[PDB]
């Protein structure tokens, strides 16, 4: 019918043309957007000649400015903000802002001056500022793509991209200002009104965006299974933010969308991962649609209304303008280089050239030019605006976007480094060898012997896309240092790949490793890592001061009552503001009487609330300042309401009544600051633990990777000192912030448990023991449980000592044994520098640290232990003198269980999982982990895999005739823990801590009482 939505065919045709161009011109250097512009011009001319196509192009070519802005800008800007690596953006925030703001202001002013002086259009300053604003917006998507696929360019890509984002936002703001000044002029404005306008467009906008963003992330974090709801909420949040900000509140909607995108990107963890990976592609697709539509519209309008009124001087002006904007951007960057080189990641001259040349123009400028064109109407200003903007876009896409690839080469930034080339060559070689093995395997299959292997091998190939003397000792030291640092990098990457290390910690550790490698004679120095766990003092100070405000110890009636009164106050807000604004709206007659009953009711509610509090608390009510404030509010209200039955009544009450909600606010602000401190401690612990584990692994690598003993000793000494410093400082962190440390540690514990549960589900599914649908059912519960980690309290009250005893590894779940121990464990307190036990002292008992940090020292081997660790298990089990001296680096508290009590417990709790067995198991796993790690240092296993593997083992009851037979098909590893063992065949003797060789078939043991033999065995999964 005639009323068909003819816009649909235009949108679909634009999509098809975009696909055709983006497919045909994929290999060529010129971007597809120029092809889209050419196609749009062809469509415009043919529609001018053919009226039937005019009906299908009109409804979108002659599109209203406001619909254009409101539909496209919130898409383009939100996509630009949402695609960024916000971490590096914040790490270079100041460097990006200086440029994107001041170099935009000066660039636009200079462009406006050029337009006023050079062009014969006689534009005034406002029109010239519009011109400069739309000429300064940039779209570096084509350049950041190249910078992503290179080396040091990784950290320049985000600088250029963030500069583009902020520049686009501020250019839209300036263009809106001057567009309203030119086409919708007011009569007059004062300095105060101008200041308020600035506050609205430059301060209120970001705050509105921030508020909407925090509300949105709250709700998203509270959505668990409905992915569609998350996607719809993102869409609605973006569009409502822009629309409400621009139309209802008249604040800068574009900046609100920028802030919203940045926040939602930073808070990505609140979105379910599948919805995150969906949303990235979704917004990419929406931005693609917007770009294609804008470019085709520009082509049509240019061919139908711009080029009809272009003179010979206009092309010369366009060329001069291209040169002028290029030079202006270059001069801006050079002028601010003296400042930028001292901030963030300072600009080298080649980076400056890349940034100057890479400033492509794009869709935003074209959209604003179309806005001007439609607003101007018959005036030539619109036609020439569109002409110049399209010309600059075309010139930058043809010249800059094509020559940037060669300029990167000329400046020497295109070269792949030797390490990357070697890694790629090794990857290609291993892939090729695997393919050859697979081919040989397949050629033996009777059902594939007839395949045409010449075609298969050709199709399956993968090509490489990149193609004692002092000097001798110094060279050996350099080689050892570099190999150790490479092993450290490998260890960090391996830790990340298993989820044991966050992305940010991995990036920071690898950055420090590469920085140390670049420097001479430089290792990883913990002083560089300390930047991680060093808390900024503002947060602790604020936490302490806020906790002071709500101490309430002089007084400290269910909490639901306080919740109810708070709800009443936050509801009552509405009548107060309604009265406050009706005071003006009146100059509505019956509203002045309508509000009376509501005010009276709320006063009565407050009166009964205060009376109940007073009676419940007795004389204690008036002792606290908050209660006095509530009483003062009642004192004011009682008098003023009776007087009412005007300005004083409305102005005073509106301020006082809401003020008492700050009491409820402060507890939540405390949670905010706790969240900040938790975000810092989580990175600090991750970095320190990653470094410690990397050192522990690289140590066992170098121990058999360097031949020289002096080199080995030096490297291991450096690593050990670094490890000791890190383990001490991370222990002090816990003492300074107990609850937040417990929060972090429980969070990581649950994360590890759930990750291993997911792996177990996947293993069951792969074996076919569980159906795909049931596996998904379980994995969904695992995923929602993991999402609920993001909402766990930032601070968890540290458990008291009794719970620590309850949670010991060998006491868990044995309620009778727990009761037995808790009645006999004695709690001791020790001060700074005190010595708890010394080397050579008899094993009189065992220590469980309930609070504080202690240092271990003995026979060379330094160490630090902290809350939750237990000292003396080996001593009580073996009854051998203590092997280390314990000194307190902080005020320390320990649960002491006398060795006689442990002996009694051992003799009494003889049930199958006996305390004896549990103690020996806990000791045996720690004895065995180093041995197995040594046995497979060069294999692919890490320490956590070794520990999980050992966890399956059990102590053999060698009382069964005191001889052991090794069925090699069912014993992955057998470890000797205590006592001597004899090879049954060769009668060879084996010392106590040892891993039984695969070459031994049977063992026989002595059974002397002092050194009873204990053996630990790990069976295959195909259990007997």
Curated annotation (Swiss-Prot):
A 1,2-diacylglycero-3-phosphate binds at residue 3. Coiled coil: none annotated. It catalyses: Na(+)(in) + H(+)(out) = Na(+)(out) + H(+)(in). A motif (Essential for sodium:proton exchange) lies at residues 167-168. Electroneutral sodium:proton antiporter that regulates intracellular pH of sperm along with capacitation and fertility. Activated in response to egg-derived chemoattractants, couples membrane voltage to sodium:proton exchange and transduces membrane hyperpolarization to cytoplasmic alkalization to cAMP signaling and ultimately to sperm motility. Homodimer; the dimerization is stabilized in the presence of phosphatidic acids. The dimer domain comprises TM1-TM3 and TM8-TM10 regions. The dimerization interface is formed predominantly by tight interactions between TM1 on one protomer and TM8 on the other. It contains an hydrophobic cavity that accomodates phosphatidic acids likely playing an allosteric role. 3',5'-cyclic AMP binds at residues 872, 874-875, 882-883. Residues 816-897 are annotated as: cNMP-binding domain. Gated by voltage and stimulated by cyclic nucleotides which shift the activation voltage closer to resting membrane potential. Not inhibited by common sodium:proton exchanger inhibitors such as amiloride. One of its GO terms (cellular component) is sperm head. This is Sperm-specific sodium:proton exchanger. Residues 473-518, 708-767 are annotated as: Interacts with the S4 segment of voltage sensor domain. Keywords: Antiport, Cell membrane, Cell projection, Cilium, Fertilization, Flagellum, Ion transport, Membrane, Signal, Sodium, Sodium transport, Transmembrane, Transmembrane helix, Transport. It is found in: Cell projection, Cilium, Flagellum membrane. The chain crosses the membrane at residues 7-26, 32-49, 66-82, 93-118, 125-150, 154-179, 191-222, 227-249, 253-266, 274-307, 313-342, 349-376, 381-411, 559-587, 588-615, 624-645, 646-670. Residues 646-705 are annotated as: S4 segment of voltage sensor domain. Belongs to the monovalent cation:proton antiporter 1 (CPA1) transporter (TC 2.A.36) family. The lineage of its organism: Eukaryota, Metazoa, Echinodermata, Eleutherozoa, Echinozoa. The record marks 651 as: Contributes one equivalent gating charge. Residues 50-65, 119-124, 180-190, 250-252, 308-312, 377-380 are extracellular. GO terms for molecular function: cAMP binding; cGMP binding; potassium:proton antiporter activity; protein homodimerization activity; sodium:proton antiporter activity. Residues 27-31, 83-92, 151-153, 223-226, 267-273, 343-348, 412-558, 616-623, 671-1024 are cytoplasmic. Residues 503-518 are annotated as: Interacts with the transport core domain. 3',5'-cyclic GMP binds at residues 872-874, 882-883. Residues 93-180, 313-411 are annotated as: Transport core domain.
């Amino acid at each position: 019918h005639a009323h068909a939505p003819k816009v649909i065919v235009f949108i679909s045709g634009s999509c098809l043309f975009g696909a055709i161009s983006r497919s045909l011109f994929k290999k060529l250097p010129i971007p597809y957007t120029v092809v889209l512009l050419i196609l749009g011009a062809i469509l415009g001319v043919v529609a001018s000649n053919v009226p039937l196509v005019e009906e299908h192009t009109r409804d979108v070519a002659h599109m209203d400015p406001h619909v254009l802005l409101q539909i496209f800008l919130p898409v383009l800007i939100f996509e630009s903000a949402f695609a960024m690596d916000v971490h590096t953006f914040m790490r270079s925030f100041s460097q990006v802002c200086i440029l994107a703001l001041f170099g935009l202001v000066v660039a636009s002013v200079l462009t406006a001056v050029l337009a006023m002086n050079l062009f014969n259009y006689n534009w005034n300053f406002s029109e010239a500022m519009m011109f400069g604003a739309i000429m300064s917006a940039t779209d570096p998507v084509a350049v950041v793509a190249l910078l992503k696929d290179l080396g040091a360019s990784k950290q320049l890509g985000t600088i250029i991209e963030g500069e583009s984002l902020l520049n686009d936002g501020c250019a839209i703001v300036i263009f809106n200002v001057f567009m309203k000044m030119v086409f919708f002029p007011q009569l007059t404005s004062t300095v105060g009104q101008n200041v308020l306008y600035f506050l609205q467009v430059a301060v209120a906008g970001p705050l509105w965006g921030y508020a909407v963003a925090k509300v949105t992330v709250f709700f998203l974090s509270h959505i668990f299974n409905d992915a569609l709801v998350e996607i719809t909420i993102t869409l609605a949040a973006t569009y409502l933010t822009y629309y409400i900000g621009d139309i209802w509140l008249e604040v800068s909607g574009v900046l609100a969308v920028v802030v919203l995108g940045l926040i939602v990107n930073a808070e990505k963890t609140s979105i379910s991962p599948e919805v995150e990976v969906f949303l990235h592609r979704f917004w990419e697709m929406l931005a693609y649609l917007a770009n294609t539509l804008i470019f085709m519209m520009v082509g049509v309008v240019v061919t139908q209304k711009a080029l009809v009124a272009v003179d010979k001087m206009d092309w010369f002006y366009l060329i001069i303008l291209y040169l002028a904007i290029t030079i202006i951007r270059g001069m801006v960057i050079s002028l601010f280089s003296p400042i930028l080189s001292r901030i963030g990641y300072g600009l080298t001259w080649r980076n400056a050239v890349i940034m100057t040349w890479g400033g492509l123009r794009g869709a935003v400028g074209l959209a604003l030019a179309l806005v001007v064109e439609n607003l101007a109407g018959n005036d030539v200003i619109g036609s020439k605006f569109l002409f110049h903007t399209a010309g600059i876009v075309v010139l930058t896409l043809v010249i800059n976007a094509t020559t940037i690839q060669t300029l990167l080469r000329i400046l020497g930034m295109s070269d792949i480094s030797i390490p990357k080339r070697l890694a790629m060559a090794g990857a290609v070689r291993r892939i090729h060898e695997g393919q050859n093995r697979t081919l040989n395997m397949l050629k033996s299959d009777r059902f594939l012997a007839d395949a045409d292997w010449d075609i298969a091998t050709a199709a399956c190939e993968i090509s490489d896309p990149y193609s004692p003397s002092p000097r001798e000792f110094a060279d050996m030291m350099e080689e050892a240092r570099l190999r150790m640092l490479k092993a450290e990098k490998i260890s960090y990457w391996k830790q990340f790949e298993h989820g044991m290390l966050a992305r940010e910690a991995l990036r920071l550790l690898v950055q420090h490793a590469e920085v140390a490698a670049d420097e001479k004679d430089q290792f990883i120095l913990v002083d560089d890592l300390k930047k991680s766990w060093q808390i900024k003092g503002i947060y602790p100070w604020l936490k302490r001061k806020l906790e002071d405000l709500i101490s309430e110890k002089k007084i400290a009636h269910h909490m639901a009552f306080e919740v109810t009164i708070n709800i009443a106050i936050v509801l009552n807000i509405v009548p107060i503001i309604m009265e406050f604004v009706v005071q003006d709206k009146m100059a509505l007659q019956k509203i002045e009487d309508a509000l009376r009953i509501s005010n009276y009711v709320f006063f009565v509610i407050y009166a009964i609330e205060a009376i109940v509090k007073i009676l419940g608390l007795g004389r204690h009510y008036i002792v606290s300042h908050w209660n006095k404030f509530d009483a003062f509010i009642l004192v004011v209200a009682l008098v003023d309401i009776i007087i009412a039955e005007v300005v004083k009544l409305f102005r005073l009450l509106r301020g006082l009544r809401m003020l008492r909600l700050t009491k409820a606010l402060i507890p939540k602000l405390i949670l905010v600051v706790n969240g900040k401190i938790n975000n810092q401690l989580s990175l600090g612990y991750d970095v320190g633990k990653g470094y410690i584990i990397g050192e522990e692994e690289v140590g066992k690598i170098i121990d058999r990777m360097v031949d020289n003993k002096k080199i080995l000793r030096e490297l291991k000494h450096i690593s050990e000192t670094g490890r000791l410093q890190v383990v001490k400082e991370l222990g002090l962190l816990q003492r300074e912030h107990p609850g937040i440390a417990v929060s972090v540690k429980t969070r990581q514990a649950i994360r590890t448990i759930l990750n291993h549960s997911r792996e177990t589900i996947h293993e069951l599914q792969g074996a076919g023991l569980l159906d795909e649908m049931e596996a998904h059912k379980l994995e969904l519960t695992v995923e929602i449980k993991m999402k609920r980690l993001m909402n766990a309290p930032s601070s968890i009250p540290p458990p008291p000592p009794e719970n620590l005893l309850k949670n010991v590894s060998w006491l868990a779940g044995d309620m009778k044994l727990i009761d037995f121990i808790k009645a006999r464990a004695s709690l001791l307190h020790f001060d700074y520098g005190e010595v708890i036990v010394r080397e050579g002292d008899e094993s009189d008992g065992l220590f469980l640290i309930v609070s504080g940090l202690v240092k271990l020292y003995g026979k060379v081997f330094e160490d630090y232990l902290t809350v939750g660790n237990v000292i003396g298990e080996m001593g009580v089990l073996t009854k051998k003198p203590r092997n280390a001296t314990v000194t307190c680096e902080t005020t320390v508290q320990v649960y002491f269980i006398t060795a006689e009590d442990m002996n009694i417990a051992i003799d009494t709790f003889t049930l199958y999982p006996s305390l004896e067995y549990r103690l020996w198991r806990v000791v045996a796993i720690r004895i065995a982990t180093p041995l197995i790690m040594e046995q497979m240092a060069f294999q692919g296993w890490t320490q956590e895999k070794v520990k999980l593997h050992l966890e399956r083992g059990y102590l053999v009851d060698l009382a069964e005739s005191h001889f052991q037979f090794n069925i090699d098909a069912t014993l992955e590893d057998v470890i000797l823990i205590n006592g001597t063992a004899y090879n049954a065949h060769t009668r060879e003797e084996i010392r106590s801590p040892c891993l039984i060789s695969r070459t031994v078939h049977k063992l026989t043991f002595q059974y002397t009482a002092t050194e009873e033999p204990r053996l630990f065995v790990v069976r295959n999964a195909e259990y007997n």
